[PDB]
Structure formats: C-alpha cells, structure tokens
Write a protein that binds this ligand. Structure first.
Ligand code: FMN
Ligand code: SF4
Lengths: 56, 216
C-alpha cells in the first residue's frame, strides 16, 4: 500500500495487528494474465493394444 | 479337388492304398511334389517322400542354401500363406502336416521359399502383404479393410516410421482378421505378419530405433 508510516502505525494500533503483512488488496504477487500453453496428459485408456472396451 | 490329388488317384487304385500308405509317417502318407525357390543354388521342383527333413531336401535337391547352410536366415515352408520359420527350427523339422503344425507354420502347398542372411525379411513380408492386398476380393469387411490396413502398417514398418507399441497393435489387428472372414484368404494374410512378429521382433524394433535416431 501507499500509506505513510504514521498511518500504518495508527492502523496497526487500532486493529491490534500488523496490517501491512496481510493486505486485502493484491498488488503484484498474483499470476500473469498471459500464460504459456499447456500440454494436458491423456489418460489410462489411450493404449494402442490390450485395450478392448469390454474389459473396461 | 486339387489337380495333384486327382492325378495321383489312378496310380493309387492300380498299385493299392497300402503302397501309398507305406510312405511317410502315420496320417502323413504318400509322396509329394516340392518347389524349392528363393536363395538356393539350384531352385527346382522335385518329388520326394512326405516326411523328408527340410534340411536334407534343400541340400540334396536344391543344391543347398546360397553361401552355405550357415547363411540361412528363414524359410517359408508351404507358400506365402504359411508363417515363416527361422534357421534354428529348420535344422530338424520334417516336411509334413503334423510336424509343421507343431512348428506353428503348416505345410500348405509344400512350396519352400528360402531367404538367406542378406535378405531384408521385413521387406519380404511386406511384399507378401501387398500381394494379399492386391488379391483380396473385397466381399467381407475384415479382409477388405484390415488387409489394406496391415499393408499400410507394414509399409511404414519397412522404413521404420512406427513406434514399438504399434507392433502389438498390428498383432491384434491380425487376430481380428483371422477366423472372422468368409474364406481363408484373411487367415493367409494374417499368418505371415504373425510369424514375422513372433520370430523377428528385434529387427523391427531396431529399425524403428534407427529411423528415430536418424530423423531426430
Ligand atoms: C485364397 C485361396 C486360394 C486357393 N487357391 C487354390 C489353388 O489355386 N489351387 C488349389 O488346388 N487350391 C487352392 N485353394 C485351396 C482350395 O480350397 C482347395 O483346392 C480345395 O479345397 C481342394 O481340396 P483338396 O486339396 O483336397 O483337393 C485356395 C484356397 C484359398 C483360401
Ligand atoms: S476373406 Fe475371402 S471373401 Fe473375405 S474379402 Fe478376403 S478374399 Fe473376399
């Protein structure tokens, strides 16, 4: 946050806890809005043999 | 009836059934015509007693394998429809129905095709599968579709494009053709790939390995 240190002290004394450690507003620690592409594995029934449907 | 079966009958009648049954093992009676072709010094057609061992026939009537008996790679004993057998089996196997059935290869038409150690076995089996693809009548679904499918798969196997898992897939595909068609042409197409996979799987695997390593 952009609050001055006196206001930080007043907030921490009024609430009784250090508010600057755990802020309600999220600033820059969240994930990027652009992500690399995924790969997404397939599954257990994607075999080429020994995979007759009557057995599963 | 086959022409050989019809043609031997008057001689059997004249000389008696006992004379014909004196040759060969039990339930494997009589004489037989053999066509030895492929990698032999003297490919030919001969008449011989039924249960003659394969090695004796090859080295006596066909002049032996080209380059010596130690140069032998594989033998197709009864025409294209029979599974091939490696050199280790041909040392003691006999040329009749029962012994070749116990060798998982069958006697067929007694047409021996000899492939030496300079043979690309995958290419030979793929050529046989191409023959069967060109000879299928197309009537029933398993032959009409699956034989073409196996032809494409074996063509890719020859280069090495495939992955090892596909080998098992190919096996299953053949099993889906055999016993599910109108006539026995489907069986005759399924059996050669089964023999090739049974006896020469490392060759296919190393071909795929070399293709992958060459093409990143
Ligand atoms: C695809 C296919 C092709 C065949 N071609 C011949 C052939 O060209 N000549 C032959 O004698 N039998 C051929 N047969 C086997 C015949 O069924 C066989 O001739 C017939 O059963 C005669 O029986 P026999 O051997 O007791 O005389 C073929 C079988 C199949 C499945
Ligand atoms: S198995 Fe026989 S009947 Fe069926 S498509 Fe092949 S040749 Fe025709």
């Amino acid at each position: 946050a952009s609050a001055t240190r006196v206001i930080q002290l007043l907030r921490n004394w009024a609430s009784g806890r250090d508010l600057q450690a755990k802020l309600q507003l999220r600033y820059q620690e969240i994930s990027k809005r652009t992500q690399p592409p995924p790969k997404l594995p397939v599954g257990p029934s994607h075999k080429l043999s020994n995979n007759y449907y009557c057995t599963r | 009836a086959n022409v050989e079966t019809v043609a031997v009958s008057p001689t059997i009648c004249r000389r008696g059934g006992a004379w014909f049954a004196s040759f060969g093992r039990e339930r494997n009676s009589g004489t037989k015509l053999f066509n030895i072709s492929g990698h032999v010094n003297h490919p030919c057609t001969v008449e011989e007693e039924m249960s003659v061992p394969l090695k004796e026939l090859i080295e006596k009537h066909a002049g032996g394998v080209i380059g010596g008996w130690d140069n032998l790679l594989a033998v197709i004993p009864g025409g294209s429809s029979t599974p091939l057998i490696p050199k280790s089996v041909c040392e003691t196997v006999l040329m009749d129905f029962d012994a070749l059935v116990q060798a998982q290869t069958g006697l067929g038409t007694a047409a021996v095709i000899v492939m030496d150690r300079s043979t690309d076995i995958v290419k030979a089996i793929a050529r046989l599968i191409e023959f069967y693809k060109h000879e299928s009548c197309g009537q029933c679904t398993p032959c009409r579709e699956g034989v073409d499918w196996m032809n494409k798969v074996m063509a890719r196997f020859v280069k090495g494009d495939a992955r090892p898992a596909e080998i098992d897939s190919l096996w299953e595909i053949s099993k889906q053709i055999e016993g599910h068609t109108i006539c026995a042409l489907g069986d005759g197409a399924a059996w050669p790939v089964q023999g090739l996979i049974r006896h020469f799987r490392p060759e296919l695997e190393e071909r795929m390995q070399q293709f992958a390593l060459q093409h990143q």
